[PDB]
Amino acid sequence: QTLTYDDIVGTGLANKCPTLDDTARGAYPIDSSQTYRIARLCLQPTTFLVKEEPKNKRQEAEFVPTKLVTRETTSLDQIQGELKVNSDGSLTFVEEDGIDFQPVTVQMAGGERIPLLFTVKNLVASTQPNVTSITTSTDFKGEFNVPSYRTANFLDPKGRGLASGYDSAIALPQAKEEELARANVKRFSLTKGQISLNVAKVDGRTGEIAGTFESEQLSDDDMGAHEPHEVKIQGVFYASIEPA
Amino acid sequence: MEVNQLGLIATALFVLVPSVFLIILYVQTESQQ
Amino acid sequence: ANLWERFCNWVTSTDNRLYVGWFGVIMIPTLLAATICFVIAFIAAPPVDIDGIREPVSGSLLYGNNIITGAVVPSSNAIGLHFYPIWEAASLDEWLYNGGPYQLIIFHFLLGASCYMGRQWELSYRLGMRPWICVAYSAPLASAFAVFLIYPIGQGSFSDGMPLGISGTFNFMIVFQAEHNILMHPFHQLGVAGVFGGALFCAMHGSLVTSSLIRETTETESANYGYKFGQEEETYNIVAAHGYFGRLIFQYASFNNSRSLHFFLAAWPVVGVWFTALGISTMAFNLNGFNFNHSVIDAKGNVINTWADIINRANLGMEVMHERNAHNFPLDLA
Amino acid sequence: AQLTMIAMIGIAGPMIIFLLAVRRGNL
Amino acid sequence: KLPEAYAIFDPLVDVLPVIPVLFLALAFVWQAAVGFR
Amino acid sequence: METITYVFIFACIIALFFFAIFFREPPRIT
Amino acid sequence: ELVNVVDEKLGTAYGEKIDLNNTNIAAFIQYRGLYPTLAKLIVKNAPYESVEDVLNIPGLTERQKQILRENLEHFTVTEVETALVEGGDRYNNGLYK
Amino acid sequence: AELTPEVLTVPLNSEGKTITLTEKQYLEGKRLFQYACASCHVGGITKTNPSLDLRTETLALATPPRDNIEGLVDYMKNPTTYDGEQEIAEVHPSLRSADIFPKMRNLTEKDLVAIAGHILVEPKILGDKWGGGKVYY
Amino acid sequence: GFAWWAGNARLINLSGKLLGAHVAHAGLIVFWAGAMTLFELAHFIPEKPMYEQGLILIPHIATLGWGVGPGGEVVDTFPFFVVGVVHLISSAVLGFGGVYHAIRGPETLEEYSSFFGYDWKDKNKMTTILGFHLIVLGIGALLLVAKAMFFGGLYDTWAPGGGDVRVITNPTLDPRVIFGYLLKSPFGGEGWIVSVNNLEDVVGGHIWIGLICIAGGIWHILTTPFGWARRAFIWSGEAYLSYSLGALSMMGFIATCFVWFNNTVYPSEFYGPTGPEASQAQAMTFLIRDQKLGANVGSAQGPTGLGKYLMRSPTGEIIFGGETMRFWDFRGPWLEPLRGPNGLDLNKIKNDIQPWQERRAAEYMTHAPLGSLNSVGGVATEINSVNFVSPRSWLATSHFVLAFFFLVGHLWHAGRARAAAAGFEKGIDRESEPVLSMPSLD
Ligand SMILES: CCCCCCCCCCCCCCCCCC(=O)OC[C@H](CO[C@@H]1O[C@H](CO[C@H]2O[C@H](CO)[C@H](O)[C@H](O)[C@H]2O)[C@H](O)[C@H](O)[C@H]1O)OC(=O)CCCCCCCCCCCCCCCCC
Ligand code: CLA
Ligand code: CLA
Ligand code: CLA
Ligand code: CLA
Ligand code: CLA
Ligand code: HEC
Ligand SMILES: CC1=C(/C=C/C(C)=C/C=C/C(C)=C/C=C/C=C(C)/C=C/C=C(C)/C=C/C2=C(C)CCCC2(C)C)C(C)(C)CCC1
Ligand SMILES: CC1=C(/C=C/C(C)=C/C=C/C(C)=C/C=C/C=C(C)/C=C/C=C(C)/C=C/C2=C(C)CCCC2(C)C)C(C)(C)CCC1
Ligand SMILES: CC1=C(/C=C/C(C)=C/C=C/C(C)=C/C=C/C=C(C)/C=C/C=C(C)/C=C/C2=C(C)CCCC2(C)C)C(C)(C)CCC1
Ligand code: OEY
Ligand SMILES: [Cl-]
Ligand SMILES: [Cl-]
Numbered sequence A: 001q002t003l004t005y006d007d008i009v010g011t012g013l014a015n016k017c018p019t020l021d022d023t024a025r026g027a028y029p030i031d032s033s034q035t036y037r038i039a040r041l042c043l044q045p046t047t048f049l050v051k052e053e054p055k056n057k058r059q060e061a062e063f064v065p066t067k068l069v070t071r072e073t074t075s076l077d078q079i080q081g082e083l084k085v086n087s088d089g090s091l092t093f094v095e096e097d098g099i100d101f102q103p104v105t106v107q108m109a110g111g112e113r114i115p116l117l118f119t120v121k122n123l124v125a126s127t128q129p130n131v132t133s134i135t136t137s138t139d140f141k142g143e144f145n146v147p148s149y150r151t152a153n154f155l156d157p158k159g160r161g162l163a164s165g166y167d168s169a170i171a172l173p174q175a176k177e178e179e180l181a182r183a184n185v186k187r188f189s190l191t192k193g194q195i196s197l198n199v200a201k202v203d204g205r206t207g208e209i210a211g212t213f214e215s216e217q218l219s220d221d222d223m224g225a226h227e228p229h230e231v232k233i234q235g236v237f238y239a240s241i242e243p244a
Numbered sequence B: 001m002e003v004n005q006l007g008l009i010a011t012a013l014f015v016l017v018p019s020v021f022l023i024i025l026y027v028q029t030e031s032q033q
Numbered sequence C: 001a002n003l004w005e006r007f008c009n010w011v012t013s014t015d016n017r018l019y020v021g022w023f024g025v026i027m028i029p030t031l032l033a034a035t036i037c038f039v040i041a042f043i044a045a046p047p048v049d050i051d052g053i054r055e056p057v058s059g060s061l062l063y064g065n066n067i068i069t070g071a072v073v074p075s076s077n078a079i080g081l082h083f084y085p086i087w088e089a090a091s092l093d094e095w096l097y098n099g100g101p102y103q104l105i106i107f108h109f110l111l112g113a114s115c116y117m118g119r120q121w122e123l124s125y126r127l128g129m130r131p132w133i134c135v136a137y138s139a140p141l142a143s144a145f146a147v148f149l150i151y152p153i154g155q156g157s158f159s160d161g162m163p164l165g166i167s168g169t170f171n172f173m174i175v176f177q178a179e180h181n182i183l184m185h186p187f188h189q190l191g192v193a194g195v196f197g198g199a200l201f202c203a204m205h206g207s208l209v210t211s212s213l214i215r216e217t218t219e220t221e222s223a224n225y226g227y228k229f230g231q232e233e234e235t236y237n238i239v240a241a242h243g244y245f246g247r248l249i250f251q252y253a254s255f256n257n258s259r260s261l262h263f264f265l266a267a268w269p270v271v272g273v274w275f276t277a278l279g280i281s282t283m284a285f286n287l288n289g290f291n292f293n294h295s296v297i298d299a300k301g302n303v304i305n306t307w308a309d310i311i312n313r314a315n316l317g318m319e320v321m322h323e324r325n326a327h328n329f330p331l332d333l334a
Numbered sequence D: 001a002q003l004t005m006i007a008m009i010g011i012a013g014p015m016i017i018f019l020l021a022v023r024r025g026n027l
Numbered sequence E: 001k002l003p004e005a006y007a008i009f010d011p012l013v014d015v016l017p018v019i020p021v022l023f024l025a026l027a028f029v030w031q032a033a034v035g036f037r
Numbered sequence F: 001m002e003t004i005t006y007v008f009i010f011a012c013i014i015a016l017f018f019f020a021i022f023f024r025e026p027p028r029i030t
Numbered sequence G: 001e002l003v004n005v006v007d008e009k010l011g012t013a014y015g016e017k018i019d020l021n022n023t024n025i026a027a028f029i030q031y032r033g034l035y036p037t038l039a040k041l042i043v044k045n046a047p048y049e050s051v052e053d054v055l056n057i058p059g060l061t062e063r064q065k066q067i068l069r070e071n072l073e074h075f076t077v078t079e080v081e082t083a084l085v086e087g088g089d090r091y092n093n094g095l096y097k
Numbered sequence H: 001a002e003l004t005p006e007v008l009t010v011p012l013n014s015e016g017k018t019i020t021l022t023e024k025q026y027l028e029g030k031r032l033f034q035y036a037c038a039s040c041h042v043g044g045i046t047k048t049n050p051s052l053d054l055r056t057e058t059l060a061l062a063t064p065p066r067d068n069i070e071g072l073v074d075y076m077k078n079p080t081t082y083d084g085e086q087e088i089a090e091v092h093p094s095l096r097s098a099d100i101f102p103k104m105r106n107l108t109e110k111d112l113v114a115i116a117g118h119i120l121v122e123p124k125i126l127g128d129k130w131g132g133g134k135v136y137y
Numbered sequence I: 001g002f003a004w005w006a007g008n009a010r011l012i013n014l015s016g017k018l019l020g021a022h023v024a025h026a027g028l029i030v031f032w033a034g035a036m037t038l039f040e041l042a043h044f045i046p047e048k049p050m051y052e053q054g055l056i057l058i059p060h061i062a063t064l065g066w067g068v069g070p071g072g073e074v075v076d077t078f079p080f081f082v083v084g085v086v087h088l089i090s091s092a093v094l095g096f097g098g099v100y101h102a103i104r105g106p107e108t109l110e111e112y113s114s115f116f117g118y119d120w121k122d123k124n125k126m127t128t129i130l131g132f133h134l135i136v137l138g139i140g141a142l143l144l145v146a147k148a149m150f151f152g153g154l155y156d157t158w159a160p161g162g163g164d165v166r167v168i169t170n171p172t173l174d175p176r177v178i179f180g181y182l183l184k185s186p187f188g189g190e191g192w193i194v195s196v197n198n199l200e201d202v203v204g205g206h207i208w209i210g211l212i213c214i215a216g217g218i219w220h221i222l223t224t225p226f227g228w229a230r231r232a233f234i235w236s237g238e239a240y241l242s243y244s245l246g247a248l249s250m251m252g253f254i255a256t257c258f259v260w261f262n263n264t265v266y267p268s269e270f271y272g273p274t275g276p277e278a279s280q281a282q283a284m285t286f287l288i289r290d291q292k293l294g295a296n297v298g299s300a301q302g303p304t305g306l307g308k309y310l311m312r313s314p315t316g317e318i319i320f321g322g323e324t325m326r327f328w329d330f331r332g333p334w335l336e337p338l339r340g341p342n343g344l345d346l347n348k349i350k351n352d353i354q355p356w357q358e359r360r361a362a363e364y365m366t367h368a369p370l371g372s373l374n375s376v377g378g379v380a381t382e383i384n385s386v387n388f389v390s391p392r393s394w395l396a397t398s399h400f401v402l403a404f405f406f407l408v409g410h411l412w413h414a415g416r417a418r419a420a421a422a423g424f425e426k427g428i429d430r431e432s433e434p435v436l437s438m439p440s441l442d
């Protein structure tokens, strides 16, 4: 059975991606001729890991765990896009559209808030060659775009912005402006992230797949005010495949 | 925060000096009776 | 000698230094809960995302605030009117980011103050008093209900209730003026009449009684030692006060009856504050102050501005600036 | 005119007091 | 608008809802007439 | 240092309330 | 070394013509017969390397092409500015009235 | 200053002709504009789509030109998008859509001329305030 | 004992003049209901929504199924005329009775008849009059049921095809549903009984209420109060007044929130959109407009980083963005067709928004319940032109104000009742001041 809105509302289930049965160890075969889309792609994070900074030389900092403070507002869903077959048997998913970002802030020990734009925007992801069947060993690896957490109209607390706002620290009329450059000049970062998607379940009949995902991206830089942190997201996904 | 350094002593004396004045007056009142 | 009757006897006892009573049985715990949470949060709570846009606002002394700028910050707009007790949060960290202390403090407080009002009725009955001091207090209680509960109900969110802070109070009243024009609303004007008028009559009545004290002391001593707590005779000459004040205005503008005088002193500010409380409460449902924007036009149709239009320019400046990152659409409908 | 009818209506009440007091009844 | 057959009573009906207010006023005429006994 | 000052003054006011209520000049009839 | 990239862009053709790669869609109301239909097409099929590329949008009727020709000289192209085109800002840049 | 025949003289068509309204027609039109249009169009803006306003310069760049009595009367009958490419009677009030916008039912032809005349006259009186929005209040 | 300004307190123990005061005052009520309907109908233009016309009574009659057809279009005004005339006429009969009993009738009833006479301290007689009135109210509630099931139905804003008058054949009887509402949190997304959102539950709850009221009426005719109740209460006329002032205050507060939030038994077709509805409508309006221009509304990141048009509630449901994130608990007939199980459905948004929903969204965003005391519609900074204040604000504000004064009246009369019952309502007996006989506190 599939539920109605009034069954789900306020449960938190709306933030959970669909699960496949543990019986679902199939294979979805790929007619290299035919074309396919991804009708629905759903990414549910379960774990937010943030890289520490180790003070001194190549002491190689670790990824430490964090507390989510923004509640059940994290999943990406309704993502759709071309699933292509390439010359060499590889499959490539090209994202077209969807609810493909969520702001998240997590809290590290000591209380520091780390906000991030958890996203797969412009995801291009590709299997190995000679797939011919999607199976419980298929791996998609891809990269995507991570635009600035805030967009250009964002005004900081003293009225400063990029596409709007003051261009100076108006409360300090005759302060020397060079110390303030990084806070006064907002810039808009656009970085790249990486995702692996590991299929662990397949319903051959329906064309649904599910499994596990790890992605790496940068946290918010507050329009260039401070340097970002590297974030690692772990979680589970769900897609359904359709002939084109 | 980059607060005024003399705020502290300004505050301490603003409390201390008038309060002490009242305490002197009260204690020597109580020991008349 | 029955155990419960003994407890009922201590609860309602008039020999306790502070009266407890049945209302006090709710009041005490609820006010301690609200107070202790408020003090802890005012000192040490981390920034709160009041407008639900992941733009946290620092309210507490440890996070860079002073006494004037500090606040316990209202709960997140993402929550709206939803109930956010601690146990509905995944973690205290979550609850703190999202503004949970504000809900704990204001609901315990409103409960406890409501019982404070009941307690006033109740001790009056145990002492054989007339009962209506609590009707007087219902004017400030209603005013607290308006800014902490009624206005958030009408607007759809505790994020638009009054912050528990000094500068937060000012933010509240500025944004209220832009969205409602409380100044042009008659119920606020009676509030001002209630509060100006009460300060006036406070000063008059205090000056008139002091003017007419009966000489009972020397120049070396406080006149106040001429009243002895519980003396039967009045300590001033109300006929001398009436004779003074009647001549300053004219006879029949001055009270000769002390009971009418003191009732009048009770009624004036209580009623004006009832109205101002009802003004907040009705602007909660957007029945706003008078709008005379462009009401005077010349014979061609030119707008001829009035002071009301200058007010509107100011109101516009507050409107376009407040919650500057929170609006995506042209109308700020709540 | 609506000013006509609310005059005949508004005069009714006071007329009742007037008639009763110049006939000296239970007021 | 009222049914055509009652159109004649339009201006009476525009004044009717204020009549309960007038009963409040009336209690004060009465009490001035008896000296606020 | 500013935080400690604010909390110190606040705490002195609470102490003062305690003394003003429980260690007041008892009011005595005449 | 820190510049505001939206202010820099105002010092290019962007600050005097409708820029096919960056300008928000409301600006196409400025000239006749361009909004909403062609403006929708133009924004969807950006970016462009020269102004004249607009005419190779598949689907144009010959009247649509004519309208574009009458307005080629109000158009410019400049490098896509990420800040002007992320967030869907070419369709709604937060400015109303 | 006053409401003179110059003010009240607006274009009838795109050919060049003019009609001169009366004070009666103008006040008529203002009144019907409040009845039928100001809920969205107060002050010459458009609440539900602020990129399109009732400023004369905007109407003159509409396809079918709408900066004349005829353009406007026509629009109130068979509205189009700004480029004239699609009819929009299903989501904009007009006589063609008077089943679904009942307020248009009792509008006579002369009511349309008054409304259209108010629209063209008002910007001559208030200038930038017509269609400028809150910046000019 | 009482002054002219407390003059009605002189009726406390005059059951005959007090019957007249009550009946004459019930006449004023019926009179107002009558005149006001006729005043509204005299002013009513059917081609204008009711809520552009300052109508508060006609929408109550329409909601009961009279005068209207599909979509709330008014189709026949004669039931509105009838309701006003009948009320109007019936007030003369109450007014006649009222001034008869206040002026000429027996000043006290008890001498004339032991049935109609009462003494406030007679606990059996008082519970018996309460019994009778409980039954009357039970009947009143069932009249609503009878209309809904046997005399035309009621208007149903939720009926498919724009809303319509619909007869109710399967009222909800399940006590879990009906009493479930009584147990729902009053807080957001919950709504206590203000969340009732279908006519089946409305009609079912009224069957229950009528039975419970009739059974209680009968219970209170046949019983006298138990000793725990006898010792718990004050038994005096002023004390009964105070209890009822408490109850009407409570009910006034409830009605305030009902007309502010509920759009089932206050259809927005008639009353205008609720505050939340109009706010949701604006987000819908600009989602529709921007998507028509090519915007991908699901993927548009807004300035803060939340979705410009669409984001997630705190429990995950896809909802409208911007400040209206506070209003995501709103449910309405023009918007539910876009809801799937996870909240608003992006494929329904991209493909299946109809024109009627575009019109309704635009209509409601431009008729939000904001306006001035002098009926200038909209936000406080808008210029004169649109003469509109939502009936929902007029009814919400008016009943807030009345509810608050009745709570004050509750406190007034309850404390006085208590003090009068123990005998110190007139002040402190100098010769026996209770404080002077207590030990001092310190
Ligand atoms: C004057 C006359 C009247 C006399 C009145 C009586 C006088 C006595 C007055 C009492 C004064 C009490 C002061 C209250 C302090 C509240 C502390 C708090 O809440 O502190 C709670 C702490 C805080 O927990 C930690 O809280 C942290 C919060 O951190 C935050 O705070 C940090 C600073 O600490 C940093 O800022 C950090 O960055 C920031 O996020 C993290 O979230 C941790 O994960 C989380 O574990 O938790 C703990 O373990 C708490 C233990 C409970 C664990 C839950 C188990 C369930 C037991 C429930 C017990 C209910 C009590 C019984 C009731 C009655 C019984 C009969
Ligand atoms: C069902 C409702 C109800 C009932 C039956 C009573 C009944 C009574 N009250 Mg209570 N009362 C109520 C509600 C009610 N009250 C409410 C809601 C409040 C709070 C506002 C009070 C507060 C109150 C006080 C303070 C007192 C009473 C008293 C009394 C007694 C005498 C009252 C009298 O003679 O009035 C006479 C009527 C007047 C003097 C006129 C009142 C004028 C009002 C305030 C103006 C309102 C005008 C309106 C807003 C709009 C005007 C428009 C304009 C065009 C005219 C009587 C037993 C008295 C008492 O204790 O007796 C035991 C008393 O002292 N009442
Ligand atoms: C709904 C409002 C209301 C009602 C129903 C009443 C009713 C009553 N009052 Mg209260 N009262 C009110 C408001 C009200 N009062 C207010 C606002 C005040 C403050 C001024 C008072 C002050 C007051 C005092 C000071 C006293 C009363 C008393 C009384 C009772 C006797 C009156 C009497 O002797 O008539 C004498 C008056 C007349 C003979 C004048 C004629 C008035 C008639 C009834 C007007 C009817 C006109 C109408 C259009 C006719 C329709 C007829 C048609 C239907 C057939 C009566 C039951 C008295 C009482 O308790 O007696 C013991 C008393 O002492 N009242
Ligand atoms: C709740 C209101 C109420 C109450 C408690 C009373 C009580 C009383 N009245 Mg009053 N009276 C009332 C309303 C009320 N009356 C009204 C509304 C009118 C004007 C129509 C009168 C006119 C009136 C007069 C002229 C006289 C009384 C008399 C009496 C006494 C004897 C009644 C009796 O046995 O008659 C017999 C009872 C009946 C024949 C009852 C028949 C059924 C009734 C009429 C219909 C009930 C249906 C329903 C509940 C309500 C109407 C439907 C409507 C809502 C659509 C008694 C104290 C007499 C008295 O005391 O004088 C010394 C007297 O002469 N009454
Ligand atoms: C107008 C309505 C009305 C009124 C005034 C009364 C009045 C009275 N009833 Mg009756 N009663 C009624 C309707 C009414 N009843 C109906 C319809 C029924 C049928 C169910 C009953 C059944 C009934 C019984 C069976 C008994 C009474 C008794 C009594 C007396 C004591 C009341 C008491 O202590 O309760 C005060 C209330 C409490 C002590 C308990 C509080 C319980 C509530 C539910 C708490 C919730 C409050 C909450 C904040 C509000 C939200 C509601 C929530 C459920 C969602 C008093 C005379 C008693 C008596 O002496 O009978 C002879 C008694 O034993 N009544
Ligand atoms: C100034 C005086 C005043 C005025 C003019 C109003 C006016 C109004 N009130 Mg308010 N009210 C007031 C004072 C006032 N109130 C006070 C002092 C309180 C207490 C604080 C309230 C508490 C209150 C509540 C709790 C509610 C109202 C509501 C309303 C509205 C509807 C009234 C209604 O339908 O009653 C109902 C009518 C009756 C009870 C009379 C009997 C009706 C019978 C049973 C109907 C039978 C119909 C049936 C279907 C017929 C079918 C028969 C079939 C077989 C043919 C109306 C605009 C309602 C509203 O809209 O709120 C937003 C509402 O819910 N009022
Ligand atoms: C009362 C009868 C009127 C009149 C005379 C006009 N309107 Fe509207 N309007 C609305 C919207 C959303 C648009 C944009 C349509 C589009 O192109 O997508 C318009 C547009 C107009 C115009 C054209 C203006 C231009 O610059 O070209 C004109 C002349 C016009 N309208 C006149 C919205 C609304 C409403 C929202 C419910 C209402 C009501 C009206 N309009 C009413 C009227
Ligand atoms: C429906 C109808 C009807 C009915 C009606 C009626 C019922 C009426 C009545 C009415 C009335 C019921 C009236 C009354 C009035 C009154 C008034 C007019 C008042 C006045 C007042 C004054 C003015 C006051 C003053 C004063 C004084 C005296 C003292 C103190 C001070 C003062 C100043 C306040 C008829 C028959 C028509 C028929 C048709 C329809
Ligand atoms: C007691 C008293 C009082 C009060 C009183 C009362 C409250 C009254 C009542 C009365 C009443 C309550 C009245 C009413 C009346 C009514 C009438 C008399 C009716 C009639 C009507 C008619 C005539 C109608 C007709 C018509 C029709 C049918 C149709 C439509 C149109 C018309 C409307 C025309 C006072 C306080 C003052 C004083 C003291 C004592
Ligand atoms: C119709 C309807 C419905 C239903 C409902 C119902 C069924 C209801 C119920 C109701 C109820 C069933 C109610 C209850 C109430 C109760 C109360 C309100 C109580 C009160 C109490 C009190 C007030 C008390 C007091 C006291 C105390 C506490 C102590 C001792 C003393 C005294 C007694 C004083 C529904 C919603 C479904 C739907 C819609 C419609
Ligand atoms: O006024 Mn303006 O309106 Ca009531 O919401 Mn919309 O903005 Mn925001 O959050 Mn607090 O404040
Ligand atoms: Cl702000
Ligand atoms: Cl918004």
Ligand SMILES: [Fe+2]
Binding pocket: C205, C209, C262
């Ligand atoms: Fe005094």
